[PDB]
Amino acid sequence: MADPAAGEKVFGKCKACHKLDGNDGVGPHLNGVVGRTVAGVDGFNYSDPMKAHGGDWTPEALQEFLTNPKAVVKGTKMAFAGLPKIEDRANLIAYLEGQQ
Numbered sequence: 001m002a003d004p005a006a007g008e009k010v011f012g013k014c015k016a017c018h019k020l021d022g023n024d025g026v027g028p029h030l031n032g033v034v035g036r037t038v039a040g041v042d043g044f045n046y047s048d049p050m051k052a053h054g055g056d057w058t059p060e061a062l063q064e065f066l067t068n069p070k071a072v073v074k075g076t077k078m079a080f081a082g083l084p085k086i087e088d089r090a091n092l093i094a095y096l097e098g099q100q
């Protein structure tokens with residue numbers, strides 16, 4: 001279950017906040033976020049528990065952060081409730097590996 005064309009319609013839930021193409025806006029640019037540090041865009045103003053995490057966004061840490069953002073980063077400035085199916089986050093993770 002890694003379909004990148006289905007991850008474009010799931011990324012329509014993200015793309016009012018997050019762009020990919022340099023702009024930022026409400027959330028940062030996600031252009032290769034799979035394998036980037038937590039708090040990893042030099043320019044965007046991040047929250048305290050996002051900066052105190054560090055490390056990396058793996059295709060596994062993103063799979064439970066994209067369904068409960070406040071369970072993995074407790075007190076994030078990301079105003080997002082969660083994705084429901086494991087196919088929704090796995091298809092989006094397959095999209096923004098290639099589409100960046």
Ligand code: HEC
Binds near residue numbers: 017027039079
């Ligand atoms: C606007 C209401 C948002 C929606 C909808 C989504 N996200 Fe977002 N994202 C937003 C903000 C304000 C932030 C920054 C949080 C902070 O600490 O200041 C974020 C952050 C993410 C991140 C972390 C990126 C990093 O540089 O470490 C990820 C990985 C992220 N958001 C992913 C993401 C996806 C894929 C969404 C759609 C399913 C999504 N966000 C929605 C704001 C908003």
